[PDB]
Structure 1
Amino acid sequence: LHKEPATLIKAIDGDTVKKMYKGQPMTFRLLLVDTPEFNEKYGPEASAFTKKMVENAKKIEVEFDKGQRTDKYGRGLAYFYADGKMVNEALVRQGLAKVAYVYKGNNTHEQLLRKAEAQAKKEKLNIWS
């Protein structure tokens, strides 16, 4: 996979952001994760984590996987990086997202995320408390 520059417009919640992509404003959904909704326990924390991580970064990048780039709802599907650090992985490592929605063909970073999840579970951190 390769990274490319991202033009973010705003973070929406823990696992969705609004991005201009090829000149179209789109919602993008983070691959391989599930954060709580904004009004569920740890929802506000997951939203604030993703929001600060993308806003404080000098450089945001997006990385598509090998399979579909859009979901059935018209959302973009990608991994995001903020100054080189994967947002998808950071959320899982902090126990603010579960590994989820693992589809064959868009699963390149599955093992990396399951490693993070296991560390968060061992630490009984946030969602795993």
Structure 2
Amino acid sequence: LHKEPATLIKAIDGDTKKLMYKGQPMTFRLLLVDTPEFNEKYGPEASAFTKKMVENAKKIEVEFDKGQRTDKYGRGLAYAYADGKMVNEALVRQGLAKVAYVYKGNNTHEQLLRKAEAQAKKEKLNIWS
């Protein structure tokens, strides 16, 4: 897998954001995770966490997996990095997302993220509290 450039256009919520990618605006949905909706418990906190992570970053990159690069809604499906740190993993490690939506062929980082979930759950963090 390969990291590619993108720039932040706007934070949206815990697991979606609007990024400019190859010079075109796109909504990106984070692979392999599910944050609570803004309306739900921890929803606000997930949204804030992702917003802070991406807005503070000097360099945003997206990394596509081996499988489908856009979902049925036209959202990009990617792992997103903020100054080298994966947003997907960071949300899970903080208990602000669950590992979810693990589809065959877009699951390169599955085990990495499950390891982070186990640690967040062991620490009883946020969703796991």
Residue matched to 2:52: 52
1:81-128 C-alpha deviation (Å, 9 max, x unpaired): 011100000000000000000001000000000000000111111000
Any unmatched runs of 5+ in structure 2?
Answer: none
Aligned mates of 1:80, 1:23 — CA distance in 2: 17
Instruction: Name the count of aligned residue pairs.
Output: 129
Contact persistence 2:35–2:98 (CA under 8 A):
yes
**How large is the RMSD of aligned CA atoms in angstroms?**
0.8
User: Could you tell which deviates more after superposition, 46-55 or 13-22?
Assistant: 13-22
TM-fit CA distance, 1:19 = 1.3
* Alpha-carbon offset, residue 58 of structure 1: 1.1
Deviations 1:52-95 (A, max 9, x none): 00011111111000100000111000000011100000000000
Give the whole-Å Cα distance in 2 for the aligned partners of 1:36 and 1:8.
Answer: 22
1:7 aligned counterpart, secondary structure: strand
Measure how far apart 1:30 and its partner are: 0.2
- Which moved further from structure 2: 47-56 or 22-31? 22-31
Matches of 2:30 and 2:106 in 1, distance apart?
A: 11
Distance in 1 between residues matched to 2:120 and 2:41, nearest whole Å: 16
Identity of counterpart residues, as a percentage?
A: 98
Q: Which moved more, 1:13-22 or 1:95-104?
A: 13-22
Contact kept, 8 Å, 2:5 with 2:21, in 1: the verdict is no
Give secondary structure in 1 for the equivalent of 2:62: strand
Please list every run of 5 or more consecutive structure 1 residues that lacks an aligned counterpart in the other structure. none
Name the SS of the counterpart of 2:103 in structure 1: coil
